[PDB]
Amino acid sequence: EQGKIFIARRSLLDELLEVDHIRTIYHMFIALLILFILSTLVVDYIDEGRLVLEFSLLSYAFGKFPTVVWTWWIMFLSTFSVPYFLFQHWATGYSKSSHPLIRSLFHGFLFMIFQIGVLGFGPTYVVLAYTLPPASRFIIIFEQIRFVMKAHSFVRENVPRVLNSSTVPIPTVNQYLYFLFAPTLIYRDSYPRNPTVRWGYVAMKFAQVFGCFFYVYYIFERLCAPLFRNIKQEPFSARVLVLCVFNSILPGVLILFLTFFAFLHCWLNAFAEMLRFGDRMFYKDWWNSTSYSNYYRTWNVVVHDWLYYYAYKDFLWFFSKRFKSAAMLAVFAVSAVVHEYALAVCLSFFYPVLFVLFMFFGMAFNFIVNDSRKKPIWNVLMWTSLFLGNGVLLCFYSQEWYARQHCP
Amino acid sequence: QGKIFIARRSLLDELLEVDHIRTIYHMFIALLILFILSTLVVDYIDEGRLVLEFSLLSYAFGKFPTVVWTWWIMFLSTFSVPYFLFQHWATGYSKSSHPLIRSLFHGFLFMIFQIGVLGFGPTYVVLAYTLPPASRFIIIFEQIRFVMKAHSFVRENVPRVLNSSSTVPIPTVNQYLYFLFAPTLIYRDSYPRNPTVRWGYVAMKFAQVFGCFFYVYYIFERLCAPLFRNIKQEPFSARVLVLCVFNSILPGVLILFLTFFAFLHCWLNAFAEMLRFGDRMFYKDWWNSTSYSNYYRTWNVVVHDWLYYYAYKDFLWFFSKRFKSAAMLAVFAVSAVVHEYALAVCLSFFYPVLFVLFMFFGMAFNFIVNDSRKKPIWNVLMWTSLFLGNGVLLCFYSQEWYARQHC
Amino acid sequence: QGKIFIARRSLLDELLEVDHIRTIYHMFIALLILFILSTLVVDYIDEGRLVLEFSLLSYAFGKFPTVVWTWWIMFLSTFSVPYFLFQHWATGYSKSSHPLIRSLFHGFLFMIFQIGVLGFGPTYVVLAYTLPPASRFIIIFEQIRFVMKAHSFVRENVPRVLNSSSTVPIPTVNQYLYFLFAPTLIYRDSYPRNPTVRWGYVAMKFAQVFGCFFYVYYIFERLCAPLFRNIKQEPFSARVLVLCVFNSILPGVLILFLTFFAFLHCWLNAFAEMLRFGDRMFYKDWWNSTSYSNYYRTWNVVVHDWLYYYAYKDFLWFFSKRFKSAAMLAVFAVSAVVHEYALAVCLSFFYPVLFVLFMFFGMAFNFIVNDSRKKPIWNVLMWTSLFLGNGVLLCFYSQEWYARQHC
Amino acid sequence: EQGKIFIARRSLLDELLEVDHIRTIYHMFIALLILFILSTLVVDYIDEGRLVLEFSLLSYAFGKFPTVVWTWWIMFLSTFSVPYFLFQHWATGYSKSSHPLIRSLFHGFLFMIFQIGVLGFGPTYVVLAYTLPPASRFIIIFEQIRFVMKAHSFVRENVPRVLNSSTVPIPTVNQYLYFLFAPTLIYRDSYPRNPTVRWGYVAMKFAQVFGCFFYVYYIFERLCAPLFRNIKQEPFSARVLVLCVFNSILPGVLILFLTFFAFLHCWLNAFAEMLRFGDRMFYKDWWNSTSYSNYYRTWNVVVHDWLYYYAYKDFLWFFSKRFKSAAMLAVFAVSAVVHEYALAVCLSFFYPVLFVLFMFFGMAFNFIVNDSRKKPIWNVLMWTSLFLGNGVLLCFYSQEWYARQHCP
Ligand SMILES: CCCCCCCC/C=C/CCCCCCCC(=O)SCCNC(=O)CCNC(=O)[C@H](O)C(C)(C)COP(=O)(O)OP(=O)(O)OC[C@H]1O[C@@H](n2cnc3c(N)ncnc32)[C@H](O)[C@@H]1OP(=O)(O)O
Ligand SMILES: CCCCCCCC/C=C/CCCCCCCC(=O)SCCNC(=O)CCNC(=O)[C@H](O)C(C)(C)COP(=O)(O)OP(=O)(O)OC[C@H]1O[C@@H](n2cnc3c(N)ncnc32)[C@H](O)[C@@H]1OP(=O)(O)O
Ligand SMILES: CCCCCCCC/C=C\CCCCCCCC(=O)SCCNC(=O)CCNC(=O)[C@H](O)C(C)(C)COP(=O)(O)OP(=O)(O)OC[C@H]1O[C@@H](n2cnc3c(N)ncnc32)[C@H](O)[C@@H]1OP(=O)(O)O
Ligand SMILES: CCCCCCCC/C=C\CCCCCCCC(=O)SCCNC(=O)CCNC(=O)[C@H](O)C(C)(C)COP(=O)(O)OP(=O)(O)OC[C@H]1O[C@@H](n2cnc3c(N)ncnc32)[C@H](O)[C@@H]1OP(=O)(O)O
């Protein structure tokens, strides 16, 4: 059935991390992390005297922070106010008059131009006018996509209701405000209250997300930054970009793992705890996934859920009756266009082949493990090829952005 | 009393096919192969040719034909003379003039065998040619194995015939040969028979032992041979010893895990598969262990079996069980002396305190994690202390070897 | 058609316990031990210390670790790839697109194995290091053994599956391993099982092989090494070659008898005893043989088995049986080529006429004693001609080697 | 029962030498003999040019041959005539008168003094007066012992007959003459005639005995003679007599084997064939023997038969009833005294410990193989000790004769 429920709970990691053997693997992992930190520290201190811990990169990336604070505030207030009261005025007087669609088309057009202009351009304008640095630029683009999807959902959950006729009204501002912070992207008025906020627990999760971000940042500064200088100096057509596409694979793996952990688990669980959300199914065991059709285990449930429900459904609805292939290619096209837009405006670089090559590689992997081929040789090969290929194309992307799209 | 076989599949096979752990495992193998491939193609581009040439291996293995002929001697000697002596002791018991003179003389002859043929033969042939400390390890390994199997083949049958009618059973040699190759150190005839030997399976396990030995070799050389030479040359001032302890951690734990795997799981399973042994209880889940007194979980059970059953029980029988703590101290002492002998003879260096400090460290760790603290903070601290302690103590050991004995 | 096992106890054991022959045997052993003791105590008094120091042995054995690793390679390779290839050929027969393309490709792969891995691998590894002509002998021995066992393991099963329902039987490998160690060269599963292995008996047989090898060594060195050096130095003029042929007779026949014993009786029985093989038909009574055409009595049957059953039968199948003589000539040719290859490669000398002249000599001897002459005069003349002929031809061979190739 | 019969036939070697495997061993043995001869010949000819074949030793040993011819002729005629006609006159008039033993004692004393003087001294006198060389001296002593035993047998076979009373007379001279050449030492008048004399067969046997004697002689000259020179020069107390007591063992074995073969087989079988004797059991398979008591397999049947029947029987008769040990020691003493006499008069040397030490060694061997010890280790040890010990004591005998009983 179509909808959203609250069965799964906690997460998908807190379920395991108290299974004895997995728990001890987890603790060994933490121990190796902390000993790697202490090793780098007290092996580049006694040898260079400085104990560097360079805080250069983020001090430039975060860039103009008060501007993103101010624009995020006005954007939150816009998304919190204008769609709410707009729909409020909308539904209350739906079929008192205007037996044709005139009222509908007109006000829906007002809403559409609101979204596209104010919520599409306003952020894009304030991010391309001041030539924002990517990190803060990424914050703005990210929150703008978030608010676009949340507004589309708040108006997708309630317009088929009022029209089927009593006439369901808009909900309380005291619940809309909450939905604007809920760890989800499907509007519901029904959210289960966990018993109590555990202030110690949310403090621990905030500590974990901040420590995870700082460890990500430190590993970056120490291992991915010097690579970036040495692809900074001579980037055009050296055959020694190979030297580092064979030298950032492992910290690329580490960054992937820790950014997933931090953002998809600690951040979301801490906000859930401060709000007592209840579901906490923010990710699936993506590593076990095998194929796209009917069996995909997304690594991000919120985005996959919104995507499926609000694009694929209505696309099979409108397009045709048996052209599933058309509708699936359509949801691929939607995801591709929005991802390319995000990454392009975020990295001042129009290079649209990244996502589509990602999907070709996903076809490759899924195929080489979806011929009923459980044989571990093929799983190991899939994993090596995943790591290697994502590193390869990451560095080719960084190269093309840095050399051929920098120099004439 | 008595050890009797039940279980199977070690722990790793059963544990792995749990899907999450199986994918963790495949990720680990992918990271290993990518690590070695990347390391290779990074130093083919920054140095020239391949930087792995198998240098230290040939110096380690050394006098191999010596070890093959001494292994045939030791094996043949263990196969015949403890067995022949025992079969001679066997038939004529309880017909003597004096009840025990036959025993005194006969057990004297057997002790002579132990201390001379297996106690001196191998150690003499290893200290004559001053063998390279790897093949020297092979020989001392085999020597303690054969000494323990002989002590077991006698302790498993002598008390049988002695108590009394046809009370004197003595087992066929055709079983003794099998036990000389069994994956255990308690003599038995009670070994079951998996339906077959799976040649594809032993092919895989032997390929796997070969690959893991090769890989530990690669890692060890490239990642701590330079550190070894540095701790050799200038070993006195604290700077380089700190620099070494704080860089001998990650490949340290890596080679530890890989050698534990390749030897306690893969090698033993290849052989037990070839001999259809059944009880593949070769290691308990070391990583979850708690403390010493009760419910200890050893990381290899065969030596733990022998130690418990053939030292603790018997020092109980020697001292009334009110001074059990005293009896317990001696098994500590036996384990200490045997390990100190092994390590010294294999490393031409008499440094006693290694094992006793390792035991004090294990005691401190058990104090950290036990008492049902179970707090992840204490467990993480225990793991960091284990890794770092193994590092620092290996390095202080290799220092006292490189410095204050070469100097 | 088909060889099937019946008999036992070679010939020597049964023949010996006839009392007269048993006492002849004990007299022989007494003369051997008295000969070596006397020889020793005569040259301890006329020279000083013991004159036996094992000089030429170490030069003969030479590159042993090379031969152990190439033996493991050859053994493993023979164990797996003929077997694996065959099991692959097995399951899918009679499902092909073209009836025989699968065969053409598959048999090509197997021929590739034979000629390259077993036809070149061992010969390449023997001619690379220019191995000493004793270990080189070990390797060529093992190589021809494994080639013949592979040809047999294929000729014993391919014609089975081919003729046609479940007509395709393919035997377990756990049997293939046993046949790779059996004392024969016709693959079978039909091997019986004497009740047990008799460890005292194999102890005796291995002590006996060791002693007989030692003794052939002693005799060979002391009695024809000086003659070897003399035929080396001045080999051209007839004087020393006459002097050598007329002194290479008695230790010649002695080492011949002793090596025949130690290898065809003792070694094979030790192994067949270890593997409980049963049919100990390892040699027919060579000394009573009569002629070639019919009722020939070979001195080792295993090679004779292979030769007859896998060359003569098949050249019958190639040429209609009216030119059987022509078919018979080819098995002569196959035996000649294989022996010439063995001897040349093992002795770095291409002298073809050795085997064909030995065959002409055997023909002349059979003409001497056969035709039911049976007169003791002709039999004695045959034996003198055999002993003397073996002597003279060995010496002309060693001359053409020492002289016209070193010169 | 006591007596002599004609069951066994041929010999004990002709029985085997047509068993296939033993036959081929025999032919290999002959081949090794002839090839050893050709080797010595054409390896000391091309190397020394002489092809020596020294005929020195026998030309001195045989010595005064016409004297032994003449004395053997007169001795044969004596043994052929005087005991015959003496007993003839004896028995014919036994109990016609002389009811007491006077006739008996008197004529028996005449016979006894005949034997001791004429047949004991006459040969001993003609061999010690001309100081005969051992070889011919050996012929004379040998034939004298032979004739003594034959006369004692001819008078032992017929005196208990005439006295038990008709009165059995002496036999025909035409049969006595035959008995004086029969290959035996127990007088019988009953000898089976084989069908025919095989002149080719007796020619072959004479060829075999002459070739055997010449091969014995050649091996002696070549291998035992140089040893004899090197114990000739410095014989007193060297410790290098050991060098050759460890260097004549094998040709001592060969001489033993070939002298046994030749004399006990070819000589006796050829004379049997020229006389068609019938028994031809001239030796037992002595190598298998194990002990003296009840189980001895003598290597010489004629002498063992005479010894037993004509010494042991009458010694148990006269001595006592249950003192078998006494009677056995008595036959040992008789054999010892006669053997020591023979060897002493033959080698101009009184050294009586040889035979008794032989018998102690025989005790040793028989004991170490008569404890039900079939184990081949003990049989091999017995054979090695037999060869070694007989060589040892042979050379100690030759030493003592040559050095301490030559020099003052
Ligand atoms: C740690 C990750 C490392 C990754 C490394 C690279 C690996 C390769 C992959 C790389 C991905 C890109 C990564 C970029 C990251 C950027 C950064 C961000 O944070 S952006 C977020 C990015 N995440 C996406 O964009 C999701 C990617 N995938 C998708 O967009 C969709 O999930 C997609 C297109 C794969 C979904 O496909 P469906 O909806 O189109 O198609 P259907 O399953 O195949 O077909 C319809 C059938 O499925 C049934 N179905 C679907 N869901 C069902 C359900 N829940 N229950 C029952 N039936 C269901 C339907 O009922 C129908 O079957 P009936 O006809 O009914 O039999
Ligand atoms: C190739 C040879 C190499 C030899 C190398 C050295 C080896 C060691 C030996 C070296 C010997 C010496 C060599 C010298 C050579 C010189 C040169 C020459 O040509 S000279 C001739 C020399 N040959 C002798 O002189 C014979 C040596 N032996 C003897 O003289 C006797 O044969 C002797 C003393 C051993 C015979 O002993 P019994 O007659 O004394 O004694 P009994 O068997 O032991 O006891 C009586 C019991 O045996 C029964 N008995 C005897 N014969 C029997 C039979 N045929 N059938 C049934 N019962 C029989 C009797 O009935 C009685 O037993 P109831 O009381 O009846 O139960
Ligand atoms: C990958 C490895 C990681 C390395 C990192 C090192 C960190 C430090 C840790 C360690 C590494 C050491 C490195 C050395 C290398 C060696 C190489 C080898 O292959 S050797 C293997 C182990 N090495 C030993 O040295 C043996 C272990 N040493 C021990 O301490 C013994 O195992 C010991 C002393 C603990 C044996 O046990 P107890 O002496 O503590 O026993 P009681 O105190 O008598 O307690 C027994 C009680 O338990 C009951 N019990 C019943 N069933 C039991 C059972 N199955 N096991 C134990 N107890 C049982 C009995 O009924 C009894 O109770 P009631 O008090 O008498 O009433
Ligand atoms: C200690 C040794 C002494 C050395 C001294 C040397 C002196 C000289 C003598 C030789 C030493 C050589 C030194 C070389 C070293 C080699 C090393 C080894 O390990 S190899 C071993 C032998 N060495 C060979 O070279 C193989 C023997 N060589 C041969 O000649 C073959 O054995 C050969 C050719 C004789 C095979 O037999 P066919 O070819 O003569 O057979 P057909 O003429 O076809 O007669 C077969 C007839 O017999 C019937 N038959 C029935 N059952 C039979 C059976 N069991 N055996 C044989 N024939 C049988 C059949 O039905 C057929 O009759 P139907 O004419 O077709 O009607």
Side-chain angles (χ1 to χ4, degrees), chain D residues 144-169 171-215:
Chain D
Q144 169 211 3
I145 302 287
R146 196 267 303 265
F147 279 133
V148 164
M149 282 165 156
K150 266 174 188 288
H152 176 282
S153 177
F154 189 79
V155 180
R156 175 57 179 164
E157 198 270 331
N158 308 264
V159 301
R161 262 167 74 178
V162 298
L163 62 83
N164 284 147
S165 315
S166 315
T167 68
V168 291
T172 302
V173 69
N174 183 211
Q175 311 287 0
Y176 185 47
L177 198 57
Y178 175 86
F179 165 67
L180 286 182
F181 292 83
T184 178
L185 288 178
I186 307 296
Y187 176 54
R188 290 273 166 275
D189 203 359
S190 66
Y191 287 137
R193 284 305 178 220
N194 310 144
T196 303
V197 162
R198 279 88 64 71
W199 284 118
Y201 170 97
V202 58
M204 189 73 218
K205 290 298 183 183
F206 285 159
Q208 282 185 39
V209 59
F210 283 157
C212 276
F213 170 70
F214 289 165
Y215 183 93

Side-chain angles (χ1 to χ4, degrees), chain B residues 43-48 54-57:
Chain B
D43 270 10
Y44 162 90
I45 299 289
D46 203 87
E47 196 270 351
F54 316 138
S55 43
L56 187 61
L57 180 137

Side-chain angles (χ1 to χ4, degrees), chain C residues 11 14-15 17-24 26-27 29-31 33-35 37-39 41-42 45-46 238-239 242-243 246-247 249-250 253 257 285 287-288 374-377 379-380 383-384 387-388, chain D residues 12 16 20-25 27-28 30-32 34-36 38-40 42-43 46-48 239-240 242-244 246-247 249-250 253 257 285 287-288 297 374-376 379-380 383-385 387-388:
Chain C
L11 280 186
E14 51 133 286
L15 208 237
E17 283 268 28
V18 176
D19 62 279
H20 292 161
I21 295 189
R22 187 265 313 268
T23 299
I24 285 189
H26 290 184
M27 283 199 218
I29 290 175
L31 294 181
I33 175 178
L34 291 174
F35 181 96
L37 160 71
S38 67
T39 264
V41 195
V42 158
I45 299 289
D46 203 87
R239 199 180 161 99
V242 187
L243 182 45
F246 282 102
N247 206 358
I249 301 311
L250 269 294
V253 304
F257 283 24
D285 59 341
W287 44 95
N288 306 140
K374 302 299 152 271
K375 321 284 186 48
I377 182 162
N379 198 19
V380 179
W383 272 116
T384 60
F387 295 155
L388 183 158
Chain D
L12 214 206
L16 318 178
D20 49 339
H21 302 172
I22 297 185
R23 187 192 81 221
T24 318
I25 288 178
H27 288 82
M28 286 189 217
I30 293 182
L32 295 156
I34 173 177
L35 268 190
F36 181 95
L38 276 196
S39 176
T40 319
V42 200
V43 168
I46 193 168
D47 200 276
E48 266 67 35
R239 270 69 70 199
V240 284
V242 169
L243 172 148
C244 274
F246 284 89
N247 205 29
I249 298 194
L250 188 149
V253 171
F257 278 20
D285 53 358
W287 50 91
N288 295 330
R297 311 192 196 178
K374 183 256 154 193
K375 301 185 58 191
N379 212 353
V380 177
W383 273 110
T384 72
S385 199
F387 291 150
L388 182 156

Side-chain angles (χ1 to χ4, degrees), chain D residues 256 292-294 299 304 307-308 312 324 331-332 335 339:
Chain D
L256 184 141
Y292 290 132
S293 276
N294 264 357
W299 59 272
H304 163 56
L307 266 182
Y308 183 12
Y312 184 33
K324 208 79 76 119
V331 68
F332 290 107
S335 187
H339 277 78

Side-chain angles (χ1 to χ4, degrees), chain B residues 8 16 74 77 92 95 127-128 137 147 170 241 268 281 283 320 330 341 371 389:
Chain B
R8 296 152 132 76
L16 219 342
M74 236 175 0
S77 238
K95 301 166 158 59
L127 290 185
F137 167 88
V147 171
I170 303 93
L241 62 86
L268 283 194
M281 186 72 156
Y283 48 91
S320 185
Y341 172 87
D371 292 331

Side-chain angles (χ1 to χ4, degrees), chain A residues 12 16 284-291 295-297 366 369 379 382-383, chain B residues 18-24 27:
Chain A
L12 214 206
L16 318 178
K284 284 165 63 76
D285 53 358
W286 167 78
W287 50 91
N288 295 330
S289 173
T290 189
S291 158
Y295 283 157
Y296 196 58
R297 311 192 196 178
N366 289 336
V369 200
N379 212 353
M382 183 271 284
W383 273 110
Chain B
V18 176
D19 62 279
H20 292 161
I21 295 189
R22 187 265 313 268
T23 299
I24 285 189
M27 283 199 218

